Design a protein around this ligand. Structure first.
Ligand code: K
Ligand code: K
Ligand code: K
Ligand code: K
Ligand code: K
Ligand code: NI
Ligand code: NI
Ligand code: NI
Ligand code: NI
Lengths: 131, 131, 131, 131
DNA sequence: AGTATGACGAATACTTAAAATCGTCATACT
DNA sequence: AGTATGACGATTTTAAGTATTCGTCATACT
């Protein structure tokens, strides 16, 4: 098999290990392998063509890599694809934005990842509602 | 923080890396992490004790007398969970409502149900975001 | 850009400078500007062909079965002037709605009126932001 | 009397002068004096006591003065007076934000100023709805 | 009185350089 | 297989410094 080195926040790591231990896992590699495999398999994306509405929601640290200042530009670039976005400051560092999108379910998907992917933007998620 | 090495079958890794490039993160580490945090969260939102946030999105028509009226009511019902609610008038008689909620994941789920029910609520979807 | 000097009575200036420090701007120039744009943009809305954005806010009781799903219907009549509408649930029966509107300042003021009307809408206010 | 030099955008200055001319004003200093005096005198501050809800709404170039990330930062500083904020991208450069505030009408008022005073935040406006 | 401008400390925008983190591999001990 | 690290380029943070653009007061013209 292949080796791979990932880098995790201390908290993430603990949260992960313990939870892997309470499940009967004696080795991380298995543990993680099962999750990747699982969540990876149960996947699906948006067919390019249909139009409609989408609801992109996600959390992120506004401090990390001028994410706040950046996320906006990211959107203003396709400002003809954003209806509005609702923000909710959940604490000094973290933020929970919810963006309503409208247009080519394709462009949407893009713009979505143009966000979600960013390092320091956890729990990304795009929900679609095509005409 | 922390850095770890795991081992996964040549097969899986390929599947993972496809995702890395295919959908955004040209970073294997993040890809994993985001999939790791998905995991922890699921098996945290469906765990006794957890509190947090949540994004309940749904559609419905403003043409039914016993549809648009109830929603708001049954929502004020537990107005201690509703942070706010963005609403869009997609077309002439259809509404796209997104409601951000906050509290014990339990009640929250409950609260979501008592909303997706009210006949006329289509595509109802809950997205939990623990602490 | 442009820089100008004006002359005002010792009296007035003192009143202005109190405002500068008292309420934010520790900058005389801005203080003035903001007050100047209030003036202009005011006698800019009450005019012809004037188009732009507007923020219609108001409160009401959802308890009244003819007030809850009553506002949404009116808004759906001008679903072409509505962008989105944020809504909060102050308490068991109080609603705080904010409707962001775009279009011609006429139809808007119109629209607003209709919504300010529907008996039971208190504190109703509309702010215009011409282009 | 006292001399004072303010700095204005070219457009602002023209918009202002012409409008001052169409009103029978032969000198700017009078024109401006009258507006300052008026709107200034016609104020309405908030006392540190009454709690309630507020509706702060403004526009601002997100690239100017790092506003996008600063605004956020400041709000996260008073992240307890903030319920939720609705953003709307009107164009590549400008943004229309609507923050719904809650708490001691006095702090709100303060906070609101910590947003409106900013060079780069035009048409700022606070609307109060106490208890 | 009402308008323009010079002059210059203060605030903000651009560049540029060094320091601290992250993302992957590869080697090495369990 | 699993897990832990050194090594090292790519990505971000900080710090630093210079060119601009502001905000006001002072001086001078209209
Ligand atoms: K991410
Ligand atoms: K609430
Ligand atoms: K609409
Ligand atoms: K908050
Ligand atoms: K301002
Ligand atoms: Ni925030
Ligand atoms: Ni609607
Ligand atoms: Ni309500
Ligand atoms: Ni914007």
């Amino acid at each position: 098999m292949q080796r791979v080195t990932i880098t995790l926040d201390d908290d993430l790591l603990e949260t992960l290990d313990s939870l892997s231990q309470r499940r009967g896992y004696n080795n991380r590699s298995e543990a993680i392998r099962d999750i990747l495999r699982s969540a990876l398999a149960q996947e699906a994306t948006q067919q390019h063509g249909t139009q409609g509405f989408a609801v992109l929601s996600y959390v992120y640290e506004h401090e990390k890599r001028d994410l706040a200042s950046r996320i906006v530009s990211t959107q203003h670039h396709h400002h003809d694809l954003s209806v509005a976005t609702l923000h909710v400051h959940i604490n000094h560092d973290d933020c929970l934005e919810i963006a309503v999108l409208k247009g080519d379910m394709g462009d949407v998907q893009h713009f979505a990842d143009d966000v979600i992917a960013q390092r320091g933007v956890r729990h990304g998620h795009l929900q679609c509602l095509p005409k």
